[PDB]
Design a protein around this nucleic acid. Structure first.
Lengths: 271, 46
RNA sequence: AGGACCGAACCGACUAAUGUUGAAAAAUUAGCGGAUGACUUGUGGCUGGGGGUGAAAGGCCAAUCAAACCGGGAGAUAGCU
RNA sequence: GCUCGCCGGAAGACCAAGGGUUCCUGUCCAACGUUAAUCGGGGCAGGGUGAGUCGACCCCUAAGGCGAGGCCGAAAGGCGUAGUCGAUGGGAAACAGGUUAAUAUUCCUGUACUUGGUGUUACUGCGAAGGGGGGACGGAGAAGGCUAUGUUGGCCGGGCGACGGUUGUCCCGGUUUAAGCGUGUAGGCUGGUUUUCCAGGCAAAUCCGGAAAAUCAAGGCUGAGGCGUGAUGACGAGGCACUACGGUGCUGAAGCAACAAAUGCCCUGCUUCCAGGAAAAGCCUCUAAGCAUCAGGUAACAUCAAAUCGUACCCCAAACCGACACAGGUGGUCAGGUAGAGAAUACCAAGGCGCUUGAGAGAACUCGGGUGAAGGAACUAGGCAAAAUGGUGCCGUAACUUCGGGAGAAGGCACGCUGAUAUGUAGGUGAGGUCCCUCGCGGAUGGAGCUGAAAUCAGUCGAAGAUACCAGCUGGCUGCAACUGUUUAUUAAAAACACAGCACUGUGCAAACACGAAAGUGGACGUAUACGGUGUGACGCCUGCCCGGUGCCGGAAGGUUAAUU
RNA sequence: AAUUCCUUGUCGGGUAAGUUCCGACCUGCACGAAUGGCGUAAUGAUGGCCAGGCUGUCUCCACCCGAGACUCAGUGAAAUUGAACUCGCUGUGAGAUGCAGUGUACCCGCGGCAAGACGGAAAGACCCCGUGAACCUUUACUAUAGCUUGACACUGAACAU
């Protein structure tokens, strides 16, 4: 649910919160937890490779099962949990054999609903089947790009992809970006849509809220000196050059895709 | 006013200690230069 | 509940005087700002010079910064004193 | 030695870091000390640092470092696996008293505790680099129960007053006692017990997890403090023989209660919120490969071992960082009294100091302050500086507004002391007694004693009762930026930088992009409701016209066009 | 107007008097819509302006309390310095203690003031000069990392047109 915070003080006037009472009010499943040390956007050389990363709240990684290879094992959802490592929520599922795993939460998956993976699994939200068996036109999420590699698409808060056609060994998909891409039909996919649609409706409302996420302040570049940025300085606000990144790339429409390795699974870029 | 030198024996040894100098080729050259000069105190070990 | 309020510790440095061969190579005195947070602090670690880091001032990188320091090319060159 | 003054959330006390003999005693006064010096953190000599329990070492790991092979790279070398290092974190155990010129939780006295080795005896399924449990974790808030601690009374000892009174409701001092062991309370958490079965925990498993039955509700775990014991002891105000007036033997009374009360403890708890909150080992269990009238395991007893290194002293400073015996800087712990909301402030206790040139004089002028006739910003670039406001309670409070604010708006009134209501009230605390019981650190009733506001009325003193320190000037119009924040350490704190919000654009994952000759790493153990870049900068109403230029994104007929041939 | 040169624009408000301020006017030298336009409550050690209170800020300073200054004893610096027996004036040489003429002036301290010694301090920073540097900019020149195009190599097999 989306709730607007009352303007009891500046920094709360524009704060919009997404409260989900169904989320577990307690510690997560300890066995499926792992250490997650922050990097600050620095690689093994110690240099800042990605700017505006640093600080934020301490987080513990959750081992989410993106493969769903437990074929033929019925599972029952135990509860929904908050995941700090991703926008979407996660669900703790108990399999019939006593194993507990973490999976992404579809749109309408709650405690007590049953899910199953495999070729013969039922066509219900949260079930994982190879895209060959899934009927064309249905909406899926956590789509695998290679057979058995693990889900790599539509893993965000409320994203989803739909199978448009079955041309044989490959299945064409319409990604959230509008891209028309084809992948092997043997790749697995999960029915339904990852359920956090309200995630995009939140308003941070203050500078500190961004810092909690680990996002450090962004310096524009026109406010720097010529030695620092191509936009450089000037007496006042001049900016008399084509917009560019640091390091001198146009970044105002210039396409940077130069993979060319596959360049065959792509049917339409987007827009 | 806080000044530049804030002593710390542990940091002193890790940065300029004898073992630290031997850990790299350039550090070993520092000792070789000091030995050639006849320095009584090769490093800051003690 | 709050980058909420008043206010010590703590962190800052807006005004004035003093000091300016100073008590001090930036401080003292009287006021002043924040003071549950984008806060502050101890210990240790990482990023190295056309590079780092920078809520961006060309700031900071050992009292040194529009290219640190140490040694070397080196007795650079100086139609100038 | 007697006074005086100063600090007393330190200018006291104990440490880390750092220093490295500055510690104690004797001796010396050239130099060092901003003066003298008999003195010293100075010279010289001697003495001083005692640990199974404190710390290090050690076991375990975080960031990160190194890194057998390995991958990569002209060489140097780079990254990194298995591993091995790395505290600022986790992991067994000691308290009180006494004692030295200088050390002590280290020595002595008393009383305890922990982890291992060996051996004896009894009962025995033991075993890992493996599995599971545990260790194990956030912010804020809220009380309740306690202790440290303090006040008063009681008790004990002493005192009867340099000047009026002081045998009493008077004065001074003391009234201290630990770990450990036993008890397991306030309170917190959890439903237990037994059988059967199972695609899971890399193989196995009696353990964990899961499923289905049966049977009882009382089981267990955690847990401050209190009480008992420790303790017929120790300590103890003051005395008595010694007593170089430097100090030691022996003796040594009371040693209780009530109330108040923490920021400490219960609490790694409880409630709540979103930003969703280390790891590993020790420890508890599980079995496998194996070993089985062995070996090993459990408990008791006995015995042995617990090494090595640090331990002086300073440590908000004269001993550390600042060239100085330098108005500087430096992390943690302890936290008395009166007033007070308070760790502010004032005055004090314990304790520590008067800051290493003094002595006179009482000019100008400078510095730091006090007061001021009449006027009251006439000063000046400018109310700079100064003056002024300042507390609690009640009443009252505008435009405007995003309906939260503005607001402590503005403004007004009352504040001391004494008595009475009430020989101390409301409230808090709670004894004895009585009753109940699964009799217990229990419940009910009970109200002694102690503690104790606030208000009303009356009276009363002063010029002044928030009397000291402490402690908002207020209001009106307007530019800029929304706001909290950030910045030129050392002349600029701002209208600049951030900012939430908005938009364009790139990016389909071996992502774009960045650091790297490369390997690889970050982005991200993320996946378009994501991430990078750019501009704008809360919010509200809006964001018009122009694609010739430049850039970017598409296009295909032709023209022109490199190596090559 | 943080933008207006002319300019203290004009009118009104506020003051006895207002180059600032506030409200309108529009002749916008040279505003203008995300290098955003116009508003905007709250906020601000932010800029400008006006009031009440308040006062030594001032008319115009006076007195007083302390620390220096002053004297005595002890200890004991510094910048500077060609050498000095180191006066005024007018003139001279381009702003004279030192030359000319002339005036004045016994020798030497101490406490004060700061007009001069073009006073001390820093081989002027402004300005110009050097076929001097350094960083920065770009459709200056010449190169180049990166990005990108094709040929050949790593690189083969048949089939159809």
């Amino acid at each position: 649910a989306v709730v607007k915070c009352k303007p009891t003080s500046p920094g709360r006037r524009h704060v919009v919160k997404v409260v989900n009472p169904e989320l577990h009010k307690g510690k997560p499943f300890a066995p499926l937890l792992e250490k997650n040390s922050k990097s600050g956007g620095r690689n093994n050389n110690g240099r800042i490779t990605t700017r505006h990363i640093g600080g934020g709240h301490k987080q513990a990684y959750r081992i989410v099962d993106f493969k769903r290879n437990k074929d033929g094992i019925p599972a029952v959802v135990e509860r929904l949990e908050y995941d700090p490592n991703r926008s979407a929520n996660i669900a703790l599922v108990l399999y019939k054999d006593g194993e507990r795993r973490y999976i992404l939460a579809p749109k309408g998956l709650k405690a007590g609903d049953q899910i199953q993976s495999g070729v013969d699994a039922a066509i219900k939200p949260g079930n994982t089947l190879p895209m060959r068996n899934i009927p064309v036109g249905s909406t899926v999420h956590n789509v695998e790009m290679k057979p058995g590699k693990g889900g790599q698409l539509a893993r965000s808060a409320g994203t989803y992809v739909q199978i448009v056609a079955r041309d044989g060994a490959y299945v064409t998909l319409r990604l959230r970006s509008g891209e028309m891409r084809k992948v092997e039909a043997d790749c697995r996919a999960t029915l339904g849509e990852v359920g956090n649609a309200e995630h995009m409706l939140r308003v941070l409302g203050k500078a500190g809220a961004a810092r909690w996420r680990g996002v450090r302040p962004t310096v524009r570049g026109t406010a720097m000196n010529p030695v620092d940025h191509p936009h450089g300085g000037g007496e006042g606000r001049n900016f008399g050059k084509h917009p560019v990144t640091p390091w001198g790339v146009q970044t105002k429409g210039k396409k940077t895709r130069s993979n060319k390795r596959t360049d065959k699974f792509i049917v339409r870029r987007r827009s | 006013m806080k000044r530049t030198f804030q002593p710390s024996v542990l940091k002193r040894n890790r940065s300029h200690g004898f073992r630290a100098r031997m850990a790299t080729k350039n550090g070993r050259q520092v000792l070789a230069r000091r030995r050639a000069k006849g320095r009584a105190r090769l490093t800051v070990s003690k």
